Short mmCIF file of C-alpha atoms in Angstrom, two decimals:
data_model
loop_
_atom_site.label_atom_id
_atom_site.label_comp_id
_atom_site.label_asym_id
_atom_site.label_seq_id
_atom_site.Cartn_x
_atom_site.Cartn_y
_atom_site.Cartn_z
CA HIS A 1 92.65 124.37 87.53
CA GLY A 2 94.50 121.09 87.68
CA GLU A 3 91.79 118.96 89.32
CA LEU A 4 88.83 116.95 88.35
CA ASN A 5 85.44 118.60 88.46
CA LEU A 6 83.43 116.07 90.85
CA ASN A 7 80.20 118.25 90.58
CA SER A 8 78.02 115.42 89.32
CA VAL A 9 80.02 112.41 90.56
CA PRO A 10 78.07 110.77 93.35
CA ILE A 11 79.53 108.92 96.39
CA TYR A 12 79.13 105.11 96.31
CA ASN A 13 78.70 103.51 99.68
CA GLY A 14 77.54 99.86 98.70
CA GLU A 15 73.89 100.74 98.10
CA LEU A 16 71.66 98.02 96.30
CA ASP A 17 70.13 100.10 93.37
CA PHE A 18 72.61 102.96 92.96
CA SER A 19 71.27 104.35 89.62
CA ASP A 20 67.79 104.97 90.80
CA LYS A 21 68.52 106.65 94.13
CA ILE A 22 70.79 108.82 92.01
CA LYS A 23 72.18 114.06 85.67
CA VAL A 24 75.04 111.47 85.71
CA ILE A 25 78.39 110.88 84.22
CA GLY A 26 78.63 107.26 82.70
CA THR A 27 82.21 107.33 81.31
CA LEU A 28 85.73 108.47 82.34
CA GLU A 29 86.24 109.88 78.76
CA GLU A 30 83.26 112.21 79.40
CA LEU A 31 84.56 113.31 82.86
CA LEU A 32 87.96 114.18 81.52
CA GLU A 33 86.29 116.25 78.62
CA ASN A 34 84.48 118.26 81.18
CA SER A 35 87.54 118.74 83.48
CA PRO A 36 89.81 121.64 83.73
CA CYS A 37 92.87 119.32 83.84
CA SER A 38 94.97 117.29 81.46
CA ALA A 39 94.02 113.73 80.70
CA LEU A 40 97.06 112.45 82.44
CA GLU A 41 96.42 114.47 85.62
CA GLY A 42 92.74 113.44 85.57
CA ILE A 43 93.39 109.68 85.24
CA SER A 44 96.05 109.88 88.06
CA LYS A 45 93.64 111.61 90.34
CA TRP A 46 90.85 109.22 89.56
CA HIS A 47 93.05 106.28 90.80
CA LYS A 48 94.06 108.18 93.88
CA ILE A 49 90.58 109.12 95.03
CA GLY A 50 88.97 105.64 94.37
CA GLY A 51 86.86 106.57 91.33
CA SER A 52 84.73 103.76 89.84
CA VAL A 53 81.44 103.00 88.04
CA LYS A 54 78.44 101.42 89.51
CA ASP A 55 75.35 100.67 87.44
CA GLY A 56 76.51 102.83 84.55
CA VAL A 57 77.02 105.83 86.89
CA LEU A 58 80.54 107.27 87.32
CA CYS A 59 81.08 107.55 91.06
CA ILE A 60 83.68 107.67 93.97
CA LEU A 61 83.90 104.99 96.57
CA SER A 62 83.22 106.18 100.16
CA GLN A 63 86.20 105.53 102.61
CA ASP A 64 84.29 103.02 104.43
CA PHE A 65 83.24 101.00 101.27
CA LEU A 66 86.78 101.21 99.92
CA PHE A 67 87.98 99.89 103.25
CA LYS A 68 85.49 96.93 103.03
CA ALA A 69 86.52 96.30 99.31
CA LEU A 70 90.16 96.17 99.98
CA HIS A 71 89.56 93.93 103.03
CA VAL A 72 87.41 91.41 101.28
CA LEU A 73 89.86 91.57 98.33
CA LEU A 74 92.85 90.70 100.58
CA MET A 75 90.89 88.00 102.46
CA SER A 76 89.73 86.35 99.18
CA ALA A 77 93.11 86.59 97.41
CA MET A 78 94.87 84.84 100.23
CA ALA A 79 92.09 82.32 100.59
CA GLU A 80 92.60 81.19 96.97
CA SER A 81 96.35 81.65 97.28
CA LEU A 82 96.49 84.19 94.43
CA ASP A 83 99.99 85.51 93.65
CA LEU A 84 99.92 89.06 95.42
CA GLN A 85 102.87 90.03 93.13
CA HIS A 86 100.98 89.14 89.95
CA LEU A 87 97.26 89.58 90.44
CA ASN A 88 94.81 90.06 87.49
CA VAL A 89 91.42 91.50 87.87
CA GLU A 90 89.63 88.30 86.70
CA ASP A 91 91.03 85.90 89.26
CA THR A 92 90.72 88.57 92.13
CA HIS A 93 87.09 89.45 91.05
CA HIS A 94 86.14 85.77 91.26
CA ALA A 95 88.00 85.06 94.50
CA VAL A 96 85.93 87.73 96.26
CA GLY A 97 82.65 86.68 94.58
CA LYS A 98 83.02 82.97 95.31
CA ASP A 99 81.30 83.07 98.60
CA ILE A 100 78.87 85.93 97.79
CA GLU A 101 75.96 83.97 96.21
CA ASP A 102 72.72 84.46 98.37
CA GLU A 103 72.66 88.16 98.55
CA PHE A 104 74.11 91.40 97.16
CA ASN A 105 77.49 91.47 95.92
CA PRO A 106 78.61 95.21 95.38
CA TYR A 107 82.16 94.10 94.31
CA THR A 108 81.90 94.24 90.58
CA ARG A 109 84.74 94.00 88.18
CA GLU A 110 84.96 97.86 88.08
CA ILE A 111 85.19 98.11 91.78
CA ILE A 112 87.83 95.51 91.94
CA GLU A 113 89.84 97.52 89.34
CA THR A 114 89.37 100.55 91.53
CA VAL A 115 90.98 98.87 94.49
CA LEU A 116 93.99 97.70 92.49
CA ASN A 117 94.43 101.03 90.95
CA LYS A 118 94.63 102.46 94.31
CA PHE A 119 96.71 100.04 96.39
CA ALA A 120 98.61 98.22 93.67
CA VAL A 121 100.64 99.02 90.64
CA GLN A 122 100.29 97.54 87.19
CA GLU A 123 103.40 95.77 85.56
CA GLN A 124 104.43 97.31 82.33
CA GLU A 125 104.04 90.60 81.42
CA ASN A 126 100.35 90.94 81.36
CA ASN A 127 97.48 93.13 82.39
CA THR A 128 98.64 92.21 85.95
CA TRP A 129 99.16 94.02 89.33
CA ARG A 130 101.64 93.85 92.23
CA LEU A 131 100.22 94.87 95.66
CA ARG A 132 101.80 97.70 97.38
CA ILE A 133 102.12 95.87 100.54
CA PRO A 134 103.88 98.44 102.91
CA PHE A 135 101.31 101.04 101.61
CA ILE A 136 98.26 98.71 102.26
CA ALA A 137 99.82 97.89 105.82
CA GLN A 138 100.09 101.76 106.48
CA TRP A 139 96.45 102.33 105.31
CA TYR A 140 95.30 99.69 107.53
CA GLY A 141 97.31 101.28 110.46
CA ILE A 142 95.73 104.73 109.88
CA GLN A 143 92.36 103.15 110.15
CA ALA A 144 93.30 101.34 113.33
CA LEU A 145 94.60 104.64 114.73
CA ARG A 146 91.44 106.41 114.08
CA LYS A 147 89.26 103.77 115.44
CA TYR A 148 91.08 102.81 118.58
CA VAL A 149 93.16 105.80 119.60
CA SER A 150 91.17 108.83 118.59
CA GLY A 151 91.37 111.08 121.75
CA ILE A 152 92.89 108.44 124.06
CA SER A 153 96.27 106.61 124.05
CA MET A 154 97.17 103.00 124.04
CA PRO A 155 100.29 100.85 124.75
CA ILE A 156 102.22 100.18 121.75
CA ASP A 157 102.15 96.45 122.02
CA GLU A 158 98.42 96.26 122.41
CA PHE A 159 98.06 98.78 119.35
CA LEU A 160 100.30 96.52 117.26
CA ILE A 161 98.10 93.63 118.04
CA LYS A 162 94.75 95.47 117.06
CA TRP A 163 96.53 96.68 114.01
CA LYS A 164 97.63 93.26 112.97
CA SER A 165 94.42 91.52 113.51
CA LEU A 166 93.01 93.44 110.66
CA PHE A 167 94.96 91.45 108.13
CA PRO A 168 94.09 88.10 106.53
CA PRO A 169 96.04 85.31 108.33
CA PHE A 170 99.51 84.74 106.89
CA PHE A 171 99.42 88.15 105.09
CA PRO A 172 103.11 88.75 104.26
CA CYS A 173 104.05 91.92 105.86
CA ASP A 174 105.81 93.06 108.97
CA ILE A 175 104.31 96.03 110.45
CA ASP A 176 106.19 98.87 112.28
CA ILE A 177 104.93 101.95 114.01
CA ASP A 178 107.37 103.93 111.71
CA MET A 179 104.91 103.15 108.90
CA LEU A 180 102.49 105.70 110.61
CA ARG A 181 104.80 108.69 110.88
CA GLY A 182 102.58 111.81 110.16
CA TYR A 183 99.42 110.16 111.65
CA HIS A 184 100.32 109.45 115.42
CA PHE A 185 102.28 110.71 118.33
CA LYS A 186 103.71 108.90 121.34
CA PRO A 187 102.31 110.50 124.45
CA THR A 188 104.82 108.45 126.36
CA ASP A 189 107.62 106.48 124.85
CA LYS A 190 105.41 103.21 124.98
CA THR A 191 102.04 104.58 124.09
CA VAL A 192 100.58 105.96 120.95
CA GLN A 193 97.53 108.26 120.03
CA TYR A 194 96.21 109.48 116.81
CA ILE A 195 96.71 113.02 115.51
CA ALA A 196 95.11 114.56 112.24
CA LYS A 197 97.61 116.89 110.80
CA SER A 198 94.85 118.84 108.95
CA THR A 199 93.62 120.43 112.24
CA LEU A 200 97.22 121.78 113.58
CA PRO A 201 97.79 125.45 113.75
CA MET A 202 98.70 127.32 110.51
CA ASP A 203 101.19 129.46 112.33
CA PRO A 204 104.49 127.67 112.80
CA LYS A 205 105.47 129.01 116.18
CA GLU A 206 102.05 128.00 117.51
CA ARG A 207 102.19 124.38 115.69
CA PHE A 208 105.59 123.67 117.09
CA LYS A 209 104.36 124.71 120.69
CA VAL A 210 101.34 122.49 120.25
CA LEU A 211 103.44 119.38 119.17
CA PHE A 212 105.91 119.88 122.15
CA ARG A 213 102.74 119.69 124.58
CA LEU A 214 101.72 116.22 122.98
CA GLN A 215 105.36 114.92 123.01
CA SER A 216 108.21 116.71 124.67
CA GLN A 217 111.00 115.05 122.49
CA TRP A 218 110.55 114.11 118.77
CA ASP A 219 112.64 112.04 116.46
CA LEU A 220 113.00 114.36 113.42
CA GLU A 221 111.37 111.80 111.28
CA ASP A 222 108.42 111.64 113.32
CA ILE A 223 107.66 115.40 113.65
CA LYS A 224 108.60 116.16 109.98
CA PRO A 225 105.39 115.10 108.21
CA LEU A 226 103.52 117.15 110.85
CA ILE A 227 105.33 120.36 110.16
CA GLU A 228 106.36 120.33 106.47
CA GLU A 229 103.36 121.95 105.24
CA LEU A 230 104.51 125.14 106.69
CA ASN A 231 107.93 125.01 105.14
CA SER A 232 107.09 127.42 102.28
CA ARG A 233 110.65 128.46 101.62
CA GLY A 234 111.60 124.90 100.74
CA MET A 235 114.68 124.86 102.89
CA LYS A 236 116.20 121.66 104.30
CA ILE A 237 113.89 120.38 107.11
CA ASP A 238 116.65 120.52 109.59
CA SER A 239 117.20 124.26 108.98
CA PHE A 240 113.38 125.07 109.10
CA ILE A 241 113.20 123.11 112.51
CA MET A 242 116.28 125.04 113.70
CA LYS A 243 114.19 128.37 113.30
CA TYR A 244 111.54 127.24 115.71
CA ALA A 245 113.10 124.48 117.88
CA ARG A 246 116.01 122.89 119.25
CA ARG A 247 117.70 119.99 117.51
CA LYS A 248 120.54 117.59 118.68
CA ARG A 249 121.88 115.11 116.22
CA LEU A 250 122.39 111.83 118.07
CA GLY A 251 124.40 109.20 116.16
CA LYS A 252 122.17 109.39 113.11
CA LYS A 253 119.02 110.21 114.81
CA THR A 254 118.07 113.93 115.42
CA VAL A 255 115.99 114.67 118.54
CA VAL A 256 113.96 117.91 118.52
CA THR A 257 112.65 119.79 121.57
CA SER A 258 111.29 123.14 122.48
CA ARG A 259 113.52 126.16 123.01
#
């Protein structure tokens, strides 16, 4: 089957008393034993979907709670001047809990560890993590697209500001709309709009037709992640595009338009 069996794995959205509002899995070892995948596949996928444990219950963080956890992690790590290139769970967990004392702190050690396993890579020195900064930047940008430019467009300079304002002050990343290839289109060359690739036509002629209505000229790198799902012959993407559209290679940039 190749995937984890999430049948009994509940979604955690920051609730106060998770174990009572929830036939539970308590351990990742248990989940792997009951899953039709290898241990390495199961562990890797656990990290990508944001699997965690809360109140002894194996769970999966909701996308809203994962966003909030990453955001407070980044604010707190900058506020304590942690080394974003050498983070350990202990300092990071302490940094986020420092100013959460009078109420409910859902950001336990395991939640912190889930965020780091999703947005960071562990170094083969200590039990230490290095943030994947461009990946975090892209993930923020995707949230900004969905919130601000779902069904309407926005000038590029205004969008970049709203995108940048999600980061902690002094966060060491330069952002660039090219990070969001596969998640947006440019209705004009100075505006941007969100697009969800999952909702595009499964017929390639119809998909290219729809994409040229959104944007009459595409850089090949911009349209590629929106069409590659249909390239089942595995050919070079330029040859695939040439079957359904016109290409013109400029200097090094290829521009693609309808035929």
